[PDB]
Amino acid sequence: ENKVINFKKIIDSRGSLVAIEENKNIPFSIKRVYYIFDTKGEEPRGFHAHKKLEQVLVCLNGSCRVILDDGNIIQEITLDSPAVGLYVGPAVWHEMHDFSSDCVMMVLASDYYDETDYIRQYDNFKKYIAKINLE
Amino acid sequence: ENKVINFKKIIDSRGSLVAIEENKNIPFSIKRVYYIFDTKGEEPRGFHAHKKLEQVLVCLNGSCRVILDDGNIIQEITLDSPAVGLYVGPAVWHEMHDFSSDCVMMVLASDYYDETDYIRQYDNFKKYIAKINL
Numbered sequence: 213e214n215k216v217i218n219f220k221k222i223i224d225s226r227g228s229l230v231a232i233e234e235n236k237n238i239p240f241s242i243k244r245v246y247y248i249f250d251t252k253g254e255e256p257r258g259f260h261a262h263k264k265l266e267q268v269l270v271c272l273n274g275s276c277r278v279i280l281d282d283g284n285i286i287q288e289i290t291l292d293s294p295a296v297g298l299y300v301g302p303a304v305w306h307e308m309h310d311f312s313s314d315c316v317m318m319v320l321a322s323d324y325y326d327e328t329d330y331i332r333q334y335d336n337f338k339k340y341i342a343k344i345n346l347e
Numbered sequence: 348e349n350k351v352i353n354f355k356k357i358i359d360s361r362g363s364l365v366a367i368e369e370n371k372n373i374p375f376s377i378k379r380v381y382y383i384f385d386t387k388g389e390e391p392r393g394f395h396a397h398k399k400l401e402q403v404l405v406c407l408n409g410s411c412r413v414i415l416d417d418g419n420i421i422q423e424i425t426l427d428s429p430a431v432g433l434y435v436g437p438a439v440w441h442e443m444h445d446f447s448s449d450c451v452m453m454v455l456a457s458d459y460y461d462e463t464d465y466i467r468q469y470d471n472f473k474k475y476i477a478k479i480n481l
């Protein structure tokens with residue numbers, strides 16, 4: 213509804229195509245595109261929140277299980293369709309689990325990588341969330 | 348004239364990561380990100396040049412054979428690594444062939460989809476180039 217994006221998909225005799233356009237079918241300007249591949253092991257990814265960064269996760273091949281925690285409710289979704297994007301706004305703790313061996317996870321981000329824009333401690337995230345609330 | 352971009356790749360026990368940043372490891376601002384998947388058939392694609400659009404092609408899974416023609420030289424390059432991008436500037440004809448069944452082709456574009464920016468006839472592409480040349 214608010215976080216799951218169903219992109220329009222073109223299908224023809226040659227295959228399938230999806231086009232994501234900044235500020236068109238995604239709410240922000242794209243500054244970075246990163247992707248995860250050649251995955252292995254049973255240790256997950258993520259476990260942090262951002263203060264300003266906006267992202268849209270898309271599973272281009274295989275599947276992956278994503279968890280979002282906005283400090284109020286926890287949501288979970290299994291991404292396994294390239295036509296499905298998951299919006300991860302600022303102030304949202306997130307985690308990525310169960311990457312299939314053939315998984316390819318693509319992320320569209322509103323800004324360049326920035327080590328300082330991370331909240332890696334859950335309690336801190338929680339605190340952070342509390343403060344924002346007050347305001 | 349080289350068009351291959353080798354991206355820095357992060358590796359750990361969990362897998363690999365590559366990060367593309369507009370105007371940082373690619374020469375333009377990204378306005379669109381499109382991808383081709385669930386491919387079939389024996390028909391190749393592309394077979395056009397753009398007048399304004401700049402793009403970076405990346406084979407995120409499987410493989411595919413790309414043909415680039417800049418009007419000076421024709422280059423055939425097989426993409427089978429997510430860490431390699433192929434820069435397709437304006438006025439550059441491109442074709443994509445031999446898509447693996449599990450292929451995933453991702454493209455970073457400098458602008459929104461625009462059918463009017465498609466030069467669809469090789470001869471016209473060549474004429475366009477000639478024009479540019481003078």
Ligand SMILES: Cc1cn([C@H]2C[C@H](O)[C@@H](COP(=O)(O)OP(=O)(O)O)O2)c(=O)[nH]c1=O
Nearest residue numbers: 244246257258324325326357364365366367
């Ligand atoms: C997401 C991202 C990470 N990185 C770097 C930062 C680290 O050195 C490495 C991995 O970052 P990341 O994998 O997100 O951090 P963590 O190990 O805490 O889960 O890749 C970039 O250079 N660019 C990016 O866009």
Ligand SMILES: Cc1cn([C@H]2C[C@H](O)[C@@H](COP(=O)(O)OP(=O)(O)O)O2)c(=O)[nH]c1=O
Nearest residue numbers: 222229230231232379381392393395459460
């Ligand atoms: C590349 C792209 C294609 N499309 C559509 C146009 C076509 O209907 C289809 C395939 O486009 P494309 O292969 O570029 O054109 P063509 O098949 O004529 O050679 O996908 C978009 O809607 N947005 C995009 O960003």
Ligand SMILES: [Cl-]
Nearest residue numbers: 288289290291
């Ligand atoms: Cl579900």
